[PDB]
């Protein structure tokens, strides 16, 4: 999480990440239910590409999370092809960036493409 | 909710969400366990426009949220129509205006028009 | 609640209101052990004529509410032709005086008529 | 509770007492698991002989609560008798003293006579 | 515990206690179970002699209690004539010296006999 | 954990290590469930290479601690052949350099290895 007590990072919660696997104990990566809960989450802790990275291996198995990867993936090329705001496209890629805390509004972008990329779920 | 430690808005917490919706788990939208629950928590809380967009997907289902968002359209032209206390009608949509951390006073009486707006569901 | 970290009131937390509720769940209104539970939210929050409204209607259902505030109205008129402590008869109406955070003595013998309004009600 | 962050009495959290009466909701009043816990409790908080009278009325019926005072009463007339700490016997009665947040030696005498009159109960 | 925000000494908290007893309700004294959760409890809260002392009380019957007790009595005077170190021989008895919170050497020392006295019982 | 409010360690919390139990209750040491669960805990933590110790005997059996004591030991000498970053081989035992708080990047090395060290584990 990106936490606002200059904007800096700290790493997961077990407690916050324990609430929110319970929330979602009874619902499919990708279902009504599953997005409504990890989208308050995004809002409420702010988390970095690497942070999104974990919370994905925390909530999803493998499979699902292999593909939700490979989906961001090419949803980053299609957006970066597509135009973003906050892009420095000589910055590095855009995860890297995504990763640097004072990249606000960047990583709000990413935060978006990252609850985007479960559309390719079925979400049942 | 727009906290109070200068008027700071700050998103919500998933712990704060949880037990709303937890005390609200046998009440349907607009009921009087409902109302009660929502009233409590908008008092504590004192939520912007977006918190309470955010609030009522969360925790009414997609129609239910369609049908409030509508009500409240009315409701704040209506409202408009009918005269308002902190309104400054040249800075911008109500809504907008209701995101204002400084804006107290309005933000207060959309509000009430936001918990006003349950009336149009049968509560049952 | 009137806190105490200049006498400040800060709106009920629902985490305190939901301890109390769970608290007299099974307890009706006027109880012995409905009343040892509010007696001592009073003492630990101090709440305001307002805060102590807001609490009756949380706990109670509105016939009851409806009559504790009948009762209480009758309560206040008696105490003010009988004396009463802190009281200015000529600062306004002791509910609004109730609600001044630095009027501590007068709200403290609020809350005990607002405590004993509950005597009108069978307890069962 | 007498505070430590000068000492300074502050009012009985509910959350606190909630956990003391859930220890000893199997255990009648002055039995070996009952004695325990207050004795915890009484270290923990440091409580006044007004603390103390609360949590008497809060963990006990008036049957046992009338019964424990009245022991007490004799306690402190025959501690007084008998020769107390920290009691100046100008200074008013020993209640009002423990009641002073400045008597901290005083206190803690006045806590061991309020926890040895439950010796008068059965304890089962 | 000694606290350590100048070492500091500050009583029990009863939800610290009764998150102990809880994780060793199905555990005899000296069991392994037991001895795990008590090790890492002492080092968490860093108990003096006294503290040790309340511990053992809450945690066990007074049969138990009675032979700890004695158990480390045996293993104080052996240690004694066994070399310690902080041992200050002319300082007073090593319980008193281990309620000293600036005596964290010794105090850390007095915390193993402690638990090594543990070792009289079956475990079982 | 090491602390991050100049790195300063400080000692496990039973509240922190009981949450983590709980989610690894029904996950045998090495299982998918059981990484994914201590990867987040070093994470969140930053334990020291005592903490680590600490953590394997309260979370798995004296033969799984065993095991992995001895495995990571093994894995330690070959990392040492192998090439380790932040390693100052002239500064003592890899084991002592991790409990170094300032050894930042050493210790994140060695809690890599650590964890690799269940990967002798059959994990069901």
Known sequence: ?????????????????????????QAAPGSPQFMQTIRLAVQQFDPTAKDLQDLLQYLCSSLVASLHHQQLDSLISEAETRGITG?????????????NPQQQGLRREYQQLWLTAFAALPGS
């Open 87 to 99: 892009y420095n496209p000589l910055a590095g890629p855009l995860r890297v960036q995504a990763n």
């Open 1 to 25: 999480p990106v936490m606002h007590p200059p904007p800096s990072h700290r790493p997961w919660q077990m407690k916050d990440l324990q609430a929110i696997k319970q929330e979602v104990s």
